[PDB]
Amino acid sequence: MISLIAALAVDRVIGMENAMPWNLPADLAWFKRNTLDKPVIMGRHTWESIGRPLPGRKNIILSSQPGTDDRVTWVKSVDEAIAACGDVPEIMVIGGGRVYEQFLPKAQKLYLTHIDAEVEGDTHFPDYEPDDWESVFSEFHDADAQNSHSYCFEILERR
Ligand SMILES: NC(=O)C1=CN([C@@H]2O[C@H](COP(=O)(O)OP(=O)(O)OC[C@H]3O[C@@H](n4cnc5c(N)ncnc54)[C@H](OP(=O)(O)O)[C@@H]3O)[C@@H](O)[C@H]2O)C=CC1
Ligand SMILES: C[C@H]1CCc2nc(N)nc(N)c2C1
Ligand SMILES: [Ca+2]
Ligand SMILES: [Ca+2]
Ligand SMILES: [Ca+2]
Ligand SMILES: [Ca+2]
Ligand SMILES: [Ca+2]
Ligand SMILES: [Ca+2]
Ligand SMILES: [Ca+2]
Ligand SMILES: [Ca+2]
Ligand SMILES: [Ca+2]
Ligand SMILES: [Ca+2]
Ligand SMILES: [Ca+2]
Ligand SMILES: [Ca+2]
Ligand SMILES: [Ca+2]
Ligand SMILES: [Ca+2]
Ligand SMILES: [Ca+2]
Ligand SMILES: [Ca+2]
Ligand SMILES: [Ca+2]
Ligand SMILES: [Cl-]
Ligand SMILES: [Cl-]
Ligand SMILES: [Cl-]
């Protein structure tokens, strides 16, 4: 079971110059809660951005080139990334944009944080077909002292 997990602002913008330009710690707790104790697959650009392997998660990095860090598992293809996970109840694909595009047809579930933020981006989440996905969880939250925007946690399962 391959899942994609991502945070989308207005117009599916997910990043700008290798950062996620919003202040929303509620998404960080949601991300941690939903990925802990599960293998995480990421692209090289996302890996370089975090700088350290995510604890309590096998970290699988996609790159066409040989790996440069033995603390993580390096892979050269989508199918080799999935194989590297072994038999686990759930695999989490955590970004970035190019990795989401390739894994989307292979995913069975999407965990989306819809952020009410106007952001200029250079990275977008893929344009998934609404008819192919069913929302099975949808929780809206207003902004507060810690979270600068209103947001919604959504779980969609492939029909
Ligand atoms: N909002 C959110 O939810 C998230 C947003 N982001 C954002 O996304 C952006 C980064 O995304 P993006 O620029 O698309 O880059 P990615 O992080 O998706 O990484 C791209 C690199 O991954 C490697 N790769 C991808 N596919 C394959 C493949 N099939 N086989 C072998 N290697 C592959 C390549 O590395 P190589 O060139 O070495 O071959 C490629 O250059 C940043 O702005 C980041 O902040 C990231 C995570 C979450
Ligand atoms: C590096 C982490 C930071 C926060 C985050 N949040 C969600 N909802 N999905 C993700 N893939 C990520 C990537
Ligand atoms: Ca746009
Ligand atoms: Ca600028
Ligand atoms: Ca950032
Ligand atoms: Ca990042
Ligand atoms: Ca950091
Ligand atoms: Ca470490
Ligand atoms: Ca980390
Ligand atoms: Ca490279
Ligand atoms: Ca597997
Ligand atoms: Ca693509
Ligand atoms: Ca909005
Ligand atoms: Ca806002
Ligand atoms: Ca782009
Ligand atoms: Ca869409
Ligand atoms: Ca439709
Ligand atoms: Ca809502
Ligand atoms: Ca369904
Ligand atoms: Cl952590
Ligand atoms: Cl807004
Ligand atoms: Cl808002």
From Swiss-Prot:
Q: GO BP, one example?
A: dihydrofolate metabolic process
What is an example of a Pfam family matching this protein?
A: DHFR_1
Q: What is this protein called?
A: Dihydrofolate reductase
Q: Where does this protein act, in terms of pathway?
A: Cofactor biosynthesis; tetrahydrofolate biosynthesis; 5,6,7,8-tetrahydrofolate from 7,8-dihydrofolate: step 1/1
This entry's Enzyme Commission designation comes to 1.5.1.3
Provide one Gene Ontology cellular component: cytosol
Family, per entry:
Belongs to the dihydrofolate reductase family.
Domain DHFR, which positions? Answer: 1-158
Presence of the UniProt keyword NADP in the record: yes
What is the species listed in this Swiss-Prot or TrEMBL entry? Escherichia coli (strain K12)
Q: What is the stated purpose of this protein?
A: Key enzyme in folate metabolism. Catalyzes an essential reaction for de novo glycine and purine synthesis, and for DNA precursor synthesis.
Q: Give the catalysed reaction(s), semicolon-separated.
A: (6S)-5,6,7,8-tetrahydrofolate + NADP(+) = 7,8-dihydrofolate + NADPH + H(+)
The reply on keyword Phosphoprotein is: no
Q: What is the effect of changing residue 28 to R?
A: In strain: B[RT500] isozyme 2
Give the matching PANTHER family. Answer: DIHYDROFOLATE REDUCTASE
